[PDB]
Amino acid sequence: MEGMVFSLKYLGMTLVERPKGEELSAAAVKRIVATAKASGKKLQKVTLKVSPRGIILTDSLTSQLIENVSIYRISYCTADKMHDKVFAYIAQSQQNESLECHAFLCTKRKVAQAVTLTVAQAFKVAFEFWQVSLVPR
């Protein structure tokens, strides 16, 4: 799997209490979107690079790393039903056991779907590396 790049806008994050499920992500995305709309600020432009290794988030203006999210930390991803331009993932924090939903605004529903499908491929290919005791690449 070649690493795929998307240039999105970061809506923000909220904690969730379980790692997987649409009930969780739907409510998280509702919260994050309402907070971003009330912010009165333009969203940070972020680039996502998706591969079986995980998701690399970089600030688009500076190309500086925000976070390299290991594939083993990410439990779930979604193209949201209600807020259909939003792609989100849930991942456990690197530094403790808390679970965070991070949401990104795409230009179009089709892009949110493409990002979700690309992340699904990364989960599948990482799993296949894992089964044969190889490092995901």
Partner: peptide
Amino acid sequence: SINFDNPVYQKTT
């Protein structure tokens, strides 16, 4: 919605 669970979540040993 289109949604996916990661089968390798937390599968570090």
